Short mmCIF file of C-alpha atoms (C1' of nucleotides) and ligand atoms in Angstrom, two decimals:
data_model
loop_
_atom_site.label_atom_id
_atom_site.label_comp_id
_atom_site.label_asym_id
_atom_site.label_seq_id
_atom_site.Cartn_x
_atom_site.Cartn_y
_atom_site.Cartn_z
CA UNK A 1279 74.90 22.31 86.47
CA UNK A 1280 77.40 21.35 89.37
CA UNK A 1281 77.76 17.74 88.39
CA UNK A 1282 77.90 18.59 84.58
CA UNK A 1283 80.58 21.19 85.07
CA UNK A 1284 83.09 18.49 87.49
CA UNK A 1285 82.32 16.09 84.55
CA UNK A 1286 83.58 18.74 81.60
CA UNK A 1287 86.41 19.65 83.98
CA UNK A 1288 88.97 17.78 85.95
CA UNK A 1289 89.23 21.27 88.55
CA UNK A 1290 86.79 23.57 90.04
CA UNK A 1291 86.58 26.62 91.67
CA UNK A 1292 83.56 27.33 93.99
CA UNK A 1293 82.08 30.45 95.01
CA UNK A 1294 79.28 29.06 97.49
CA UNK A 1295 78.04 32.11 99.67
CA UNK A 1296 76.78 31.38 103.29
CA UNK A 1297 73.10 30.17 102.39
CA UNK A 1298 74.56 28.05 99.67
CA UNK A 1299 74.41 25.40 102.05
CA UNK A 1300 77.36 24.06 99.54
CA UNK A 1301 79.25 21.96 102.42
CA UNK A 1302 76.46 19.41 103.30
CA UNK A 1303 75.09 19.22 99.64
CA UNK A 1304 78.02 19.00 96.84
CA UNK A 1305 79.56 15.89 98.69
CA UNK A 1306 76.28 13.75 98.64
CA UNK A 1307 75.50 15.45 94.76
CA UNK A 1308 78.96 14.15 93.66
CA UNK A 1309 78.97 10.32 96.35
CA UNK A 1310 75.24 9.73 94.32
CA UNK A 1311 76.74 10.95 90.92
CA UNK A 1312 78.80 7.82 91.27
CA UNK A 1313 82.34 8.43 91.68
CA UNK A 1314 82.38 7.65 95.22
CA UNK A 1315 82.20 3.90 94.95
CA UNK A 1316 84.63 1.22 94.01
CA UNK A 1317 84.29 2.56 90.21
CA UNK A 1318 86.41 5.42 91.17
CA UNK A 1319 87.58 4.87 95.15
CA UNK A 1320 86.75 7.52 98.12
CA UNK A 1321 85.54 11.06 98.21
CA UNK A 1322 87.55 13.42 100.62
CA UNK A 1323 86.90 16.62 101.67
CA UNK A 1324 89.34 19.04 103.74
CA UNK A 1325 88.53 21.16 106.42
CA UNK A 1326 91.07 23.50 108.55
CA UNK A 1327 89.34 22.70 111.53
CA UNK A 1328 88.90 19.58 113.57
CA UNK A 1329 85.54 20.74 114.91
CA UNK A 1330 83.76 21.61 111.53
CA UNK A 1331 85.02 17.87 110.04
CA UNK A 1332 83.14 16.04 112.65
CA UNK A 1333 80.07 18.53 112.66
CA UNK A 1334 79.51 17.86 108.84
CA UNK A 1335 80.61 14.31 108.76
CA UNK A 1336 77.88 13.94 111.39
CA UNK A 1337 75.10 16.07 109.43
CA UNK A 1338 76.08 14.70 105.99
CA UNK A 1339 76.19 11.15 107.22
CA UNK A 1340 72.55 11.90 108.88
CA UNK A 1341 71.17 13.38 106.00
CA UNK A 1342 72.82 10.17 103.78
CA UNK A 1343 70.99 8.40 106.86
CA UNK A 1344 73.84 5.62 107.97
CA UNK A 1345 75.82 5.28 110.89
CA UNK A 1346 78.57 7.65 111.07
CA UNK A 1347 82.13 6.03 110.07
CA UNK A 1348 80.28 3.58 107.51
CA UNK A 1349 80.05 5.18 104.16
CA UNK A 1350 79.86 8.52 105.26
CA UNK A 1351 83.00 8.89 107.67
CA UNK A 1352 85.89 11.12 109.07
CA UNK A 1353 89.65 11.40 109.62
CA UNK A 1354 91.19 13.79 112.07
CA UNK A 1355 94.10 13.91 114.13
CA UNK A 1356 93.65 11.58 117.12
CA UNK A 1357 90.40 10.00 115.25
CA UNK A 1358 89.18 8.14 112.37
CA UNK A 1359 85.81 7.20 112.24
CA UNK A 1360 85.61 4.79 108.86
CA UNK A 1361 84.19 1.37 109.70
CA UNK A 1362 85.81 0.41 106.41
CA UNK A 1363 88.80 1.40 104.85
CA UNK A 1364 86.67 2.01 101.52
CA UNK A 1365 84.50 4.85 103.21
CA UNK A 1366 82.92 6.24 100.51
CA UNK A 1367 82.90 9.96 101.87
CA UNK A 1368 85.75 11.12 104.14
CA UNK A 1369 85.67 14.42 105.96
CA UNK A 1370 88.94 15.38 107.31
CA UNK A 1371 91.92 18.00 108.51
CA UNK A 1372 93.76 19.29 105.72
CA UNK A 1373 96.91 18.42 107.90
CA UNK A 1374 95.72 14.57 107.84
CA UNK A 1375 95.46 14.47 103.75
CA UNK A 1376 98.78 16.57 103.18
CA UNK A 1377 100.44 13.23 105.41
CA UNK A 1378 98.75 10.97 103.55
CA UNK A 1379 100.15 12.40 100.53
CA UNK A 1380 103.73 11.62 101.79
CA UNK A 1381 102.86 7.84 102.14
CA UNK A 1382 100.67 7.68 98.48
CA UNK A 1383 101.04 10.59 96.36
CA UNK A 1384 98.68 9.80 93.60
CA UNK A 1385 96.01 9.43 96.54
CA UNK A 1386 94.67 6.58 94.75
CA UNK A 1387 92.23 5.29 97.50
CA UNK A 1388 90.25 8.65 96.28
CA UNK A 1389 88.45 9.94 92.90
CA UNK A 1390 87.39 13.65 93.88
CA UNK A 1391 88.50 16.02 96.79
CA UNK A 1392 86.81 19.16 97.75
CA UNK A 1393 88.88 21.89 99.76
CA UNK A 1394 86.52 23.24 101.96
CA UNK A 1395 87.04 27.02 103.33
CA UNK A 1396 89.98 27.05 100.98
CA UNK A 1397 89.32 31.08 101.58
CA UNK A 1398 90.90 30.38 105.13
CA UNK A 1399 94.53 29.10 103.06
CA UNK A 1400 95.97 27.42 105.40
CA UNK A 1401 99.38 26.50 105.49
CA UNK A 1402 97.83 22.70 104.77
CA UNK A 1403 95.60 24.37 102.08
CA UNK A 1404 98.60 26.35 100.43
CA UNK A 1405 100.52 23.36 100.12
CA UNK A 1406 97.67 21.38 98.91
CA UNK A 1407 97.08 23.54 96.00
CA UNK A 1408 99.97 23.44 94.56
CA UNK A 1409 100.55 19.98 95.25
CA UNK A 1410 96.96 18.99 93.34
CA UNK A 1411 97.96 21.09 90.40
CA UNK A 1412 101.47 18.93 89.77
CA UNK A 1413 99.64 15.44 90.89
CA UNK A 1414 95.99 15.89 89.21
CA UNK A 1415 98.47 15.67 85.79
CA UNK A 1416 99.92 11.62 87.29
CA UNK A 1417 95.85 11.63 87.83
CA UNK A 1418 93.40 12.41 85.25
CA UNK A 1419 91.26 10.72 87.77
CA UNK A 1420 91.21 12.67 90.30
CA UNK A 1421 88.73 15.55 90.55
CA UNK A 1422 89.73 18.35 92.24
CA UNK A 1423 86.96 20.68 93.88
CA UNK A 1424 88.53 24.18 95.48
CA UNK A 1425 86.35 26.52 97.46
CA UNK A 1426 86.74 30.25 97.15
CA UNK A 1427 86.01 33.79 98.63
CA UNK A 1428 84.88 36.71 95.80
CA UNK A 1429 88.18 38.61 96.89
CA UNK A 1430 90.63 35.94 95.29
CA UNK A 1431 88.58 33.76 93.08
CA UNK A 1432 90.20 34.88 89.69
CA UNK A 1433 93.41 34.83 91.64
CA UNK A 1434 92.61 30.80 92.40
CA UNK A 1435 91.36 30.01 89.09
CA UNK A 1436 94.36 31.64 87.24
CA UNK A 1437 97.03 29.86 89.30
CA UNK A 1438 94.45 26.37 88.62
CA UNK A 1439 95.23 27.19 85.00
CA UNK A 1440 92.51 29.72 84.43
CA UNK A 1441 90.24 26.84 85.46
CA UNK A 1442 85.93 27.80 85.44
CA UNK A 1443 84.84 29.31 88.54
CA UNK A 1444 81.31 28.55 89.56
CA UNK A 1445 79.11 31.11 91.56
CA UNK A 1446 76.27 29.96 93.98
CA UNK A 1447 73.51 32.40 95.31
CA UNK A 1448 73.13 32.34 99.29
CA UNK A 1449 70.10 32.82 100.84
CA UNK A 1450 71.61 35.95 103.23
CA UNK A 1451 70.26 39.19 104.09
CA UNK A 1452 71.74 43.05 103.41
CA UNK A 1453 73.92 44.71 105.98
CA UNK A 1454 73.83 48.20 106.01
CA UNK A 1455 77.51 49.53 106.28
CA UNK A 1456 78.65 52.66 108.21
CA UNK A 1457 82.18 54.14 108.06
CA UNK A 1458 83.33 56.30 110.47
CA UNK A 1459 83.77 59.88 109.03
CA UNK A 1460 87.36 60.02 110.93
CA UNK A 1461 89.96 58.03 112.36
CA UNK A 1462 88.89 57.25 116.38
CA UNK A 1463 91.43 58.35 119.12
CA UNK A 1464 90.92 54.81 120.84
CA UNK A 1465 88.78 52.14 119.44
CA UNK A 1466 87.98 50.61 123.27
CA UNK A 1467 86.63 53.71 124.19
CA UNK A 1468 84.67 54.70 120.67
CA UNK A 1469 83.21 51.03 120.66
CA UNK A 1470 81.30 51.48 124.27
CA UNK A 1471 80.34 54.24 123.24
CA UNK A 1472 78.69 53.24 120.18
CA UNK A 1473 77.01 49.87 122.12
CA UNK A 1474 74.95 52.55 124.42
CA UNK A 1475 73.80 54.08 121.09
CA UNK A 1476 72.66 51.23 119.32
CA UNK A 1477 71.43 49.39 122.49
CA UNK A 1478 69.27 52.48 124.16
CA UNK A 1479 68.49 55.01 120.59
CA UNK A 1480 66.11 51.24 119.93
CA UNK A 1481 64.15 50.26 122.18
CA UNK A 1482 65.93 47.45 124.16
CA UNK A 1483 64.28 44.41 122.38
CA UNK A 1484 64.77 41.96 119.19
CA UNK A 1485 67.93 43.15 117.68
CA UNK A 1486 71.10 41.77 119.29
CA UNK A 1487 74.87 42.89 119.19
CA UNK A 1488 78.31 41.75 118.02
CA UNK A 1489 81.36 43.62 119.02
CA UNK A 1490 84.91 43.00 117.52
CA UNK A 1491 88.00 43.59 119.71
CA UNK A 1492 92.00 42.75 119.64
CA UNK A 1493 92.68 40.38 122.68
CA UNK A 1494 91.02 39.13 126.21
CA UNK A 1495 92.64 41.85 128.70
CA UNK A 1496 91.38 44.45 125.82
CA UNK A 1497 87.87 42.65 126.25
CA UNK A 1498 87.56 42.04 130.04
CA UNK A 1499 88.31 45.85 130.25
CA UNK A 1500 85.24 46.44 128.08
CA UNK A 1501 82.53 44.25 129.86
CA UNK A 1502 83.03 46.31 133.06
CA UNK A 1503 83.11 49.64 130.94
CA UNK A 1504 79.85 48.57 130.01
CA UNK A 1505 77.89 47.38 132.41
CA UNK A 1506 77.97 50.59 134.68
CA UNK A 1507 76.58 52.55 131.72
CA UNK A 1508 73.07 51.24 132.11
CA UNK A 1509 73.69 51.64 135.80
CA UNK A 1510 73.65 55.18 135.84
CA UNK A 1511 70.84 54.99 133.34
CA UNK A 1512 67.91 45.36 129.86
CA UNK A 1513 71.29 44.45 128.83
CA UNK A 1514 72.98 40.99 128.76
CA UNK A 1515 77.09 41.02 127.98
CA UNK A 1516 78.85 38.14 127.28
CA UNK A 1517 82.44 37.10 126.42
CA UNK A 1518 83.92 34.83 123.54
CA UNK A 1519 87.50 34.17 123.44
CA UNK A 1520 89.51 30.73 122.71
CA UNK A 1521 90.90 30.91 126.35
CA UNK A 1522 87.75 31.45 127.49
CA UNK A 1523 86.77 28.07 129.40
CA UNK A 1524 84.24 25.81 127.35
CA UNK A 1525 81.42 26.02 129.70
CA UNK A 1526 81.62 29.77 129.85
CA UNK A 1527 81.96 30.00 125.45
CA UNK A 1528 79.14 27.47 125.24
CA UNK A 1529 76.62 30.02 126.96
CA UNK A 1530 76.86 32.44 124.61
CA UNK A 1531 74.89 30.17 122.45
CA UNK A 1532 71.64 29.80 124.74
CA UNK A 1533 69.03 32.30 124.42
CA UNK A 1534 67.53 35.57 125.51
CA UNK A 1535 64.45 37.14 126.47
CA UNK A 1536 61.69 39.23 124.60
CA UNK A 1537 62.48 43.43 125.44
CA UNK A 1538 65.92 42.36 127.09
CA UNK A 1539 69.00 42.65 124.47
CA UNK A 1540 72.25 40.31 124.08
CA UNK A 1541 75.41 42.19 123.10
CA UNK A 1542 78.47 39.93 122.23
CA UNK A 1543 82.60 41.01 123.14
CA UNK A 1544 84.44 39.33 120.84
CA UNK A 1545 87.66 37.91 118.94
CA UNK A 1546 88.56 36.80 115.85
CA UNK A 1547 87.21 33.75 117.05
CA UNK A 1548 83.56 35.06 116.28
CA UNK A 1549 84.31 35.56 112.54
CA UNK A 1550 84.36 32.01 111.37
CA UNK A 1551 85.22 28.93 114.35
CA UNK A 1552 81.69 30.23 116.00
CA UNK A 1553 78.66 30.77 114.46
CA UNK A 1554 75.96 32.81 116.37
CA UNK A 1555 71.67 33.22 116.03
CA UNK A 1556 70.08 36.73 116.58
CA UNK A 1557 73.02 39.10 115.99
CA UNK A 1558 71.53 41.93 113.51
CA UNK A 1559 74.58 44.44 114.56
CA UNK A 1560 77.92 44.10 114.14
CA UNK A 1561 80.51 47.38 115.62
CA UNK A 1562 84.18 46.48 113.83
CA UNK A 1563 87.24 48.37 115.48
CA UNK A 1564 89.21 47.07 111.91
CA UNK A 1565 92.00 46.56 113.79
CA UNK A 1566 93.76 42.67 114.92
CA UNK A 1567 96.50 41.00 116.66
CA UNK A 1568 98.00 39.13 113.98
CA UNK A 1569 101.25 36.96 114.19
CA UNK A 1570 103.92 37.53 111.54
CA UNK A 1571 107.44 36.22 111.51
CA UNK A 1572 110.47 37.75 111.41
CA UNK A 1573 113.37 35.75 109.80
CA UNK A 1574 115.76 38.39 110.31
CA UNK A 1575 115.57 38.14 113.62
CA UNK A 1576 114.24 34.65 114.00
CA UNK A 1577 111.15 36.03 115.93
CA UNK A 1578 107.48 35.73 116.05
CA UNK A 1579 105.50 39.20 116.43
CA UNK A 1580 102.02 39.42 117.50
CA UNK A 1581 100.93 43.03 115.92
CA UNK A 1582 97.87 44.96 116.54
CA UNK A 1583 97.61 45.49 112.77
CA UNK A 1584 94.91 46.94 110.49
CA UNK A 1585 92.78 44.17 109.51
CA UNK A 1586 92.06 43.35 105.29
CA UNK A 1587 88.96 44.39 103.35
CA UNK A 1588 88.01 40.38 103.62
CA UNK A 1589 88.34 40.26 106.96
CA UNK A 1590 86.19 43.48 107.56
CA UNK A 1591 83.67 42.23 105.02
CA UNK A 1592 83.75 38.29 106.71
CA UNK A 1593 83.20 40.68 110.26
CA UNK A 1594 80.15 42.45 108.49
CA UNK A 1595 78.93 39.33 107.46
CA UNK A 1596 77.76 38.15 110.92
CA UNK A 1597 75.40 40.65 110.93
CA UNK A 1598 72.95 39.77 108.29
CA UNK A 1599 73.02 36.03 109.36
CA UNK A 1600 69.31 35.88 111.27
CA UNK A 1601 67.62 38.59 109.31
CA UNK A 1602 68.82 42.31 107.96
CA UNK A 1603 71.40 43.84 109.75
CA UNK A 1604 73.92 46.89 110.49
CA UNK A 1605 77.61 46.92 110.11
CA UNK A 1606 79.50 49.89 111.74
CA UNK A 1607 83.08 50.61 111.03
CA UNK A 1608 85.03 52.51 113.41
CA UNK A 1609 87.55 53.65 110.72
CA UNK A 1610 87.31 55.42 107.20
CA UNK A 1611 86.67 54.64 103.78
CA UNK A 1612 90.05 55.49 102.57
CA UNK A 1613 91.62 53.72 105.53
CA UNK A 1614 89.86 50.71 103.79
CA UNK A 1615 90.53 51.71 100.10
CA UNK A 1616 94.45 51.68 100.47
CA UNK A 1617 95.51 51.18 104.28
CA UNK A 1618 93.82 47.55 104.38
CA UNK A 1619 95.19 45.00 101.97
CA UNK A 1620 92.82 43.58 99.99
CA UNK A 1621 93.61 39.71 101.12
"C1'" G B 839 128.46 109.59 130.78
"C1'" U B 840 122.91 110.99 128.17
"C1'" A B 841 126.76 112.68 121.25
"C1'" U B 842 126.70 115.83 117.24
"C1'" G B 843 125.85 118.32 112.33
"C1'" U B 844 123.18 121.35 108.73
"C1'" C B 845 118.66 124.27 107.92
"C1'" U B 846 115.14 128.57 108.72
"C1'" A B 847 112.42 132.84 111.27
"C1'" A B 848 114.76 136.91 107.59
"C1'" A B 849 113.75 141.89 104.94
"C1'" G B 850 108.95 142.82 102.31
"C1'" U B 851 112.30 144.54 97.53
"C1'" U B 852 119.06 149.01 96.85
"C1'" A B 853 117.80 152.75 91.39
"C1'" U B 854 119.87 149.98 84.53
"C1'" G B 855 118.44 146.04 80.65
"C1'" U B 856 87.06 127.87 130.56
"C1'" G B 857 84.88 122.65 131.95
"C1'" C B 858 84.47 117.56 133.83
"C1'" U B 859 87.34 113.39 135.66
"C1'" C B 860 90.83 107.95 136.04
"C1'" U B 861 95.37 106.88 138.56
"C1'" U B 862 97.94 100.73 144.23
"C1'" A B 863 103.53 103.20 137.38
"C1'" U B 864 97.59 102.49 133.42
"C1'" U B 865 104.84 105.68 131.11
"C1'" U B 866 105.54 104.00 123.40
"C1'" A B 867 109.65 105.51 129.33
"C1'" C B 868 114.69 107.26 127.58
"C1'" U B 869 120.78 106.91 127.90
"C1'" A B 870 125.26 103.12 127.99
"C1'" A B 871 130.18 106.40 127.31
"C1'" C B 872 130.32 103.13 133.05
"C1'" A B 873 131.51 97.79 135.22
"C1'" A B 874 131.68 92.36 134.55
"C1'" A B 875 137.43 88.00 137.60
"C1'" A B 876 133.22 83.99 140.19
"C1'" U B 877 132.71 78.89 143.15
"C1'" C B 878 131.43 78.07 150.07
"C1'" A B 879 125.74 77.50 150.69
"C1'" A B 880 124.92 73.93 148.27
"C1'" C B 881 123.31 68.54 146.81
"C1'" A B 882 118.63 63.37 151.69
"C1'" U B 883 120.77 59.74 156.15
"C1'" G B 884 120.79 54.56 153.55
"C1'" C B 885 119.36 52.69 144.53
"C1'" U B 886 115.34 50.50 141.00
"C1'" A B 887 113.08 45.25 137.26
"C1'" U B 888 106.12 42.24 135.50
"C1'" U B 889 101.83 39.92 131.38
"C1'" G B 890 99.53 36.66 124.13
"C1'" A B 891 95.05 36.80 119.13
"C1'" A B 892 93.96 32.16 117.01
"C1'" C B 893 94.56 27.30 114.84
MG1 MG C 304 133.87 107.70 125.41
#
RNA sequence: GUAUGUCUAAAGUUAUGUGCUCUUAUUUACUAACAAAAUCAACAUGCUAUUGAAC
């Protein structure tokens, strides 16, 4: 049904969920369709981060079985890996396609793109979209793949000229969701206070903890908070920040023990550039330190801000990763209804 | 300078048609005509500034 419908249309919108496994799949489903080789030139697909372009280039190109850069390859900022310049599928930064569109703007060296984690919309992304939408008419060609959330998916297709929408099933597991029946006085302080709960109401073992929080000085403050709880009362608390030294966020990853329990401090950082095994709770203060400019003023402000219902719901979706989880909200319904934006 | 005013008790009918017992003001405290032109006695012996999420 995937490779029918990107035959009957010239652009797609995708709805793949997180068990989809879309990423790794659609790109060999489309290379061994055909279009891929010199009857139509390259696949590309965009990613918004460097990290995630080599990761899949490297799975994708293992699971095609060939040496990575030789028809499965990538292109990122500092690197391209493609043993030939007709490398049949090309991973890469959205940033590296939207220069390459300055030097060939029909993008002729390709026949389909796919913008991965579109849902992200990236500056690169942004641009990208509505920079397909003028060049796929110069290209009848050119396939254009777009990857979407369930908040804006209408909202992607009618701008892509009410274009179909396809919806995959993911193999992912409820989250039970718990608002808080009032607005807390201080999320730090409501947030320890709800770890204890979950961690000693269970018994300490096989159920393990994500905790979402503003910035590092806001999270240093909490691992010490923590820790002397179960003092005057096992526990293991860990860190995850970008700051946060490589060796140190690499840790986080490694295991723990049978009746001992891992609970996870964490930014943004947790929702989508890390990915983490185990975690069956998630605790979400709903509030984050975005940037926004002001042109008035000519000056960047980083705001502790209510976050969207997306972001809440991406933040609830780390829980329910492993096996069926719990999400708890340390704000209201109604707080969510108008307060958060839905985007 | 603790306002002041009015009222009534009248007369019956004026002849016709003792216990108990609190109290360190525990008072429902009351009056304002009186006076108001308040400043010597001030003030310590030497002046400060601080921390961002993520790509
Ligand atoms: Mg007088």
């Amino acid at each position: 049904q995937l490779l029918s419908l990107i035959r009957e249309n010239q652009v797609v919108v995708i709805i793949g969920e997180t068990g989809s496994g879309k990423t790794t799949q659609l790109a060999q489903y489309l290379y061994e369709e055909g279009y891929a080789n010199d009857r139509g030139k390259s696949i590309v697909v965009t990613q918004p981060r460097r990290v995630a372009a080599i990761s899949v280039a490297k799975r994708v190109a293992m699971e095609m079985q060939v040496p990575l850069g030789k028809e499965v390859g990538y292109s990122i900022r500092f690197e391209d890996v493609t043993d030939s310049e007709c490398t049949k599928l090309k991973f890469v930064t959205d940033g590296i396609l939207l220069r390459e569109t300055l030097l060939d703007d029909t993008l002729d060296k390709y026949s389909c793109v796919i913008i991965d984690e579109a849902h992200e919309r990236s500056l690169n992304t942004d641009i990208l979209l509505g920079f397909f939408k003028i060049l796929l008419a110069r290209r009848r060609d050119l396939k254009l793949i777009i990857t979407s959330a369930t908040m804006n998916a209408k909202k992607f297709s009618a701008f892509f000229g009410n274009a179909p929408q396809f919806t995959i099933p993911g193999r992912t597991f409820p989250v039970q969701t718990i608002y808080t029946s009032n607005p807390v006085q201080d999320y730090v302080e409501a947030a320890v206070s709800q770890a204890v709960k979950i961690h000693l109401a269970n018994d300490c073992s096989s159920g393990d903890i994500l905790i979402f929080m503003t910035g590092q000085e806001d999270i240093e403050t909490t691992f010490d908070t923590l820790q002397e709880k179960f003092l005057q009362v096992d526990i293991e608390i860990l860190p995850i920040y970008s700051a946060l030294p490589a060796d140190l966020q690499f840790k986080i990853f490694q295991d723990l023990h049978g009746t001992k329990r891992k609970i996870i401090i964490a930014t943004n950082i947790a929702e989508t550039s890390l990915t983490i095994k185990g975690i069956r709770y998630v605790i979400d203060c709903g509030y984050s330190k975005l940037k926004v400019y002001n042109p008035k003023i000519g000056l960047d402000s980083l705001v502790i801000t209510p976050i969207s219902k997306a972001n809440a719901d991406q933040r609830s979706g780390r829980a329910g990763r492993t096996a069926p989880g719990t999400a708890y909200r340390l704000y209201t319904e109604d707080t969510f209804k108008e307060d958060m934006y839905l985007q």
